[PDB]
Design a binder for this molecule. Structure first.
Ligand code: HEC
Ligand code: HEC
Ligand code: HEC
Ligand code: HEC
Ligand code: HEC
Ligand code: HEC
Ligand code: HEC
Ligand code: HEC
Ligand code: HEC
Ligand code: HEC
Ligand SMILES: [Ca+2]
Ligand SMILES: [Ca+2]
Ligand SMILES: [Y+2]
Ligand SMILES: [Y+2]
Ligand SMILES: [Y+2]
Ligand SMILES: [Y+2]
Ligand SMILES: [Y+2]
Ligand SMILES: [Y+2]
Ligand SMILES: [Y+2]
Lengths: 471, 471
């Protein structure tokens, strides 16, 4: 048994586990070191055109340390600027994979109630970032999945549930609670007091399997769309960090190497043996993350990984350039009078092209986890995009614009202009929110004893729109 | 020293080495077991359209056992039907990588003289198939490169020559004498007797490096073209088995694993240790070819290799379908009056699209040797093809054929019709050649003591146009 077999008071605050596990706590807090903010819209402006009409066209950055998960969720322009617990653009489900307070609230008020309402609803309750309680039982300290949608997805796909999986499988599944692709399923229900409510439930699109094509069939079957494209009016699908799905069928995944083997390698200091909890870039310490299984040179392995990234970049830029042009050319055809019937096939191609390309790039480590599937997906997506463009030439020609040249979107500024994103307004409104309601959330959370000031150190120094220099 | 330190009389006939190396000779002759003839034009008819106007549109089969190299060189419709030593469509260089008689003749008459004249020139001299003398010194038995163009290519690319390479590197370079991409360089010269002659010299396009793009730049720089496309009139480049080039930068190649490690694995019978000379499919005996370095399941490894082949197939069919359509659409534009100036950019795209796609598929093991580069190449080639097709829509529209639908080529028969290949005539003419001049070549070679009847056992049972049932 553990030294806390009856549980841990205040379990949602990771600091509460420190007295029992100083090593794991100290390494866990070190993800604070990964504070870089890479603005993906700035690096890949084609993404702005791809996501026109959707929140990702406003703000989208690369992943950084777990230490910043909650604050980034608050800072992203995607969550907008609520003025109370009933306003703001996004639902409560947006907190789900950012805090140990989520399982706390779910175990308290239930899954449906948790998924009901606005993101702003839990502003002064969900205040701790990815912690011990997201992956560990507070009595046995054993690995556990705290989100019901994971098992439901696993079962639907023909996989064993978390409880029925091997220990090695669990070392990856704890990550899969969050590092997977999902969608929100509008779910109607009624609470104990007889009140009819509507929940937006996190759902893994795995009922037909976890391949990109199977998920595609899943979404098409239910005629689902995350949004109607702002330029092409195509019914779009948004892929979000399908890290586990892509990893699962990559060679390491097929071999049984777990996320933890590379990202949380075992370490030994003296006679002390434990798992490095500083989840980050495995290449930072290859002797612990790679050289236990590989006998070659570290530099050679790093050069190989770099090559994989370069291949992905090559195909990514091609696919999204054609996807972007397709969206714009469809928008031009629309302006000229093209009917929905004339654009149906084209829009279907675009929907599929971007779903495949986004699934390939949304998982930031996929270029390494599953290189070959990533390249195949980008090639497949590009082909669908070009099929759409070949057809668009004919539609444009019919309306007298065969020589139309889709506008360029090589800078974030130009792309957001094409996507009609009023950044100045969004940023101004966001800053107001941060200076008022956000501070009230934190003040109240601290007053109630749900949040310890210590955890906020250097947590709000950067975002894609401001930089106090370094988080 | 060896038991034949002064050399081997009749060294070009591998049977002559049997008295010294029975083990290697016995395994070497077993490639006779790999007699399957896979008609690639039948399996992938899109290749016929791709090679319209070129010999490969007539006959192109997958590689089989070394035992059949010489006979297949004779049987392929590509070498046609000469009536004497001064006729036939192809040059003497076509024997180069098919027989140990090649180095014999080169060391005798010199490289330029060997590369001068028709393929038919050496019909009764080059009669032994890939043998000991192609890779071994007949005095020391040490590995050697017998073709001067390999070192010239290696040096041009910044690589060490064969003599300066490590033993492990030589275990791959002996294969590279033949398993590489090349082109024929028209070379003018004058013999000792003062006669001006023209040679077609095998040349490795490596002066800018061995990557597909570098070779592409090499060919474009010298404005080279293997042939003018029969349908699109595009200046085409033909890629031929760039096995080593693609392997070199694949992970096994980067790690230093040699061709021999997988294709000629070390074997031990009792106290006897030797290299398995039955060059074939490593998957036939993974315990010798893979399991010495891999600790997983053989079935799992095989399933992974199968997956790689499926990914390659997926992209290959897409790329060649668009390449085929591009050729046909260009031919249609030509029929309508499109000028060379109007088609220049399109033809450049087609040339590059097919060069990249052909480089990706011409090496039959590349899907495994360098999976990621193969997928990237097929994706790149397809993109160039689609760029050509988008432009072709506009050219076709200008001439009133915007709704033109390129004809289908899903069967070898339909494709060869589009490529205007008179198979009946070619096969009839070939059979006549085989029944007359070929038999005379063999009868004379046997009479002169250059060929032993033993080596012909079951060697001429199959081809892509006849099957006595099984070679
Ligand atoms: C949900 C509760 C999560 C669990 C469980 C795990 N991760 Fe995570 N991860 C999550 C978020 C929201 C983020 C973004 C943080 C931000 O503010 O940007 C991440 C980020 C990572 C990263 C990036 C690290 C870096 O760039 O420095 C990695 C490498 C990563 N996550 C891996 C990972 C692994 C291996 C997990 C299981 C052991 C794991 N995460 C669990 C959310 C959640
Ligand atoms: C779990 C199933 C998740 C849900 C539901 C949402 N997010 Fe998430 N988010 C998750 C992970 C594993 C990651 C890291 C890996 C990656 O590819 O990003 C993230 C990251 C973020 C970030 C930081 C990166 C960025 O996009 O700027 C933000 C700002 C973020 N997530 C916001 C967010 C919102 C608003 C959500 C509701 C729509 C949401 N996430 C849901 C996992 C999960
Ligand atoms: C999920 C993303 C995790 C978070 C957040 C934390 N831990 Fe963890 N922990 C995780 C894994 C995958 C593992 C390895 C499990 C295995 O047996 O292979 C661990 C392990 C531990 C252990 C056991 C001893 C060890 O291997 O180090 C302890 C005691 C532990 N973790 C404690 C702990 C604490 C205190 C955390 C919060 C600060 C914490 N973990 C977060 C995954 C995750
Ligand atoms: C070792 C063989 C690994 C396994 C198994 C997994 N990951 Fe990984 N991951 C690894 C590398 C070398 C890299 C590239 C360098 C980097 O840190 O980016 C990655 C990357 C990621 C990322 C992207 C992080 C970022 O761009 O900021 C994420 C989010 C990530 N890995 C998550 C992750 C998960 C959840 C895994 C199991 C499903 C997983 N990785 C396995 C190496 C290895
Ligand atoms: C052991 C548990 C492993 C860890 C930790 C890492 N890798 Fe690995 N890797 C492992 C296996 C079993 C395999 C498959 C080959 C085999 O022996 O069966 C691999 C393969 C690779 C490859 C080749 C795959 C490819 O390039 O497409 C690379 C380049 C590779 N591994 C890199 C790598 C790096 C950088 C790691 C640390 C972050 C790493 N591996 C960890 C087993 C294990
Ligand atoms: C030129 C003299 C060659 C040398 C040296 C090597 N190979 Fe070869 N190989 C060559 C030809 C002309 C052919 C085609 C034979 C035919 O009649 O179709 C081949 C074929 C192979 C194959 C196919 C085996 C099969 O399908 O059963 C393989 C696997 C192959 N060659 C590999 C290979 C290796 C590893 C070499 C070096 C040790 C090697 N070849 C040398 C011509 C020549
Ligand atoms: C070495 C540099 C070569 C030259 C010059 C030529 N060939 Fe070849 N050939 C070579 C190899 C390594 C292979 C096997 C691998 C592969 O991808 O095929 C081959 C194979 C053939 C075959 C059998 C397969 C087929 O195409 O049907 C034939 C019939 C063949 N080669 C004919 C041939 C001709 C006519 C040449 C002159 C233009 C020629 N080869 C040159 C290596 C080399
Ligand atoms: C090139 C394609 C080869 C042909 C044709 C033949 N051999 Fe070979 N042989 C080759 C390699 C790559 C190797 C391994 C070299 C190393 O040291 O790693 C060998 C080796 C031999 C040896 C040495 C002992 C052994 O490893 O088995 C002998 C005595 C030998 N080869 C003999 C031999 C004979 C008699 C051949 C014709 C029948 C023959 N080899 C063809 C490559 C090639
Ligand atoms: C092991 C890691 C290998 C190395 C190193 C090389 N090859 Fe290979 N090759 C290997 C496999 C598993 C396969 C696929 C199965 C098959 O036999 O086709 C191949 C295939 C080839 C082929 C294609 C043969 C055919 O389709 O008939 C050729 C011509 C071939 N390999 C040649 C070859 C050469 C010359 C190498 C070094 C440059 C080489 N291979 C390395 C496994 C391995
Ligand atoms: C040792 C000399 C090897 C032989 C023989 C074969 N492989 Fe290999 N393989 C080896 C290394 C060093 C690596 C790179 C990973 C690492 O540990 O550094 C690999 C990798 C693979 C992979 C992963 C690459 C990928 O999938 O993209 C596969 C699938 C693989 N090897 C398969 C394989 C097969 C089928 C072999 C026999 C024909 C084979 N390998 C031989 C080392 C060696
Ligand atoms: Ca989604
Ligand atoms: Ca060539
Ligand atoms: Y406490
Ligand atoms: Y990062
Ligand atoms: Y130890
Ligand atoms: Y003799
Ligand atoms: Y074969
Ligand atoms: Y042994
Ligand atoms: Y790979």
């Amino acid at each position: 048994k553990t030294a806390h077999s009856q549980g841990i008071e205040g379990k949602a605050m990771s600091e509460e586990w420190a007295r029992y596990y100083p090593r794991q706590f100290d390494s866990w807090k070190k993800t604070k070191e990964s504070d870089n903010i890479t603005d993906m819209l700035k690096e890949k402006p084609a993404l702005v055109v791809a996501w026109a009409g959707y929140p990702f066209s406003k703000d989208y950055n690369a992943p950084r340390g777990h230490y910043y998960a909650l604050q980034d969720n608050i800072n992203t322009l995607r969550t907008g600027a609520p003025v109370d617990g009933k306003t703001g653009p996004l639902p409560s489900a947006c907190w789900t994979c950012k805090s140990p307070d989520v399982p706390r609230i779910i175990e308290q008020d239930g899954e449906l109630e948790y998924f009901t309402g606005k993101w702003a609803k839990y502003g002064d309750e969900i205040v701790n970032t990815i912690g011990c309680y997201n992956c560990h039982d507070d009595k046995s300290a054993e690995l556990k999945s705290k989100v019901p949608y994971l098992d439901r997805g696993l079962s639907a796909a023909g996989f064993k549930t978390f409880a029925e999986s091997t220990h090695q499988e669990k070392r990856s599944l704890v990550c899969a609670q969050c590092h997977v692709e999902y969608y929100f399923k509008k779910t109607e229900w009624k609470d104990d007091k007889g009140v009819d409510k509507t929940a937006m439930v996190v759902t893994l699109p795995w009922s037909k399997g976890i391949s990109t094509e199977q998920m595609e069939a899943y979404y098409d079957e239910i005629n689902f769309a995350d949004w109607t494209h702002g330029i092409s009016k195509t019914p779009m699908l948004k892929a979000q960090h399908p890290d586990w799905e892509l990893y699962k069928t990559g060679i390491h995944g097929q071999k049984g190497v777990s996320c933890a083997d590379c990202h949380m390698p075992y370490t030994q200091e003296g006679a002390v043996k434990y798992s490095d909890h500083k989840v980050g870039n495995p290449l930072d310490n290859m002797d612990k993350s790679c050289m236990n299984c590989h006998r070659e040179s570290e530099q050679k392995l790093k050069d190989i990984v770099k090559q994989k990234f370069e291949r992905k970049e090559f195909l990514q830029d091609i696919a999204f350039d054609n996807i972007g042009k397709a969206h714009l050319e469809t928008g031009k055809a629309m302006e000229l009078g093209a009917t929905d019937a004339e654009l149906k096939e084209i829009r279907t191609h675009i929907r599929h092209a971007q779903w495949r390309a986004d699934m390939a790039i949304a998982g930031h480590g996929s270029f390494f986890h599953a290189p070959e599937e990533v390249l195949r997906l980008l090639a497949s997506g590009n082909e669908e995009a070009q099929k759409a463009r070949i057809k668009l030439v004919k539609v444009l020609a019919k309306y007298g614009a065969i020589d139309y040249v889709a506008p360029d979107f090589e800078t974030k500024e130009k792309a957001q202009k094409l996507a009609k994103v009023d950044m100045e307004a969004f940023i101004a409104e966001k800053l107001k929110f941060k200076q008022t309601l956000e501070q009230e959330w934190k003040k109240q959370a601290i007053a109630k004893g749900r949040l310890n000031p210590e955890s906020l150190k250097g947590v709000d120094e950067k975002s894609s729109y401001y930089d106090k220099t370094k988080k």
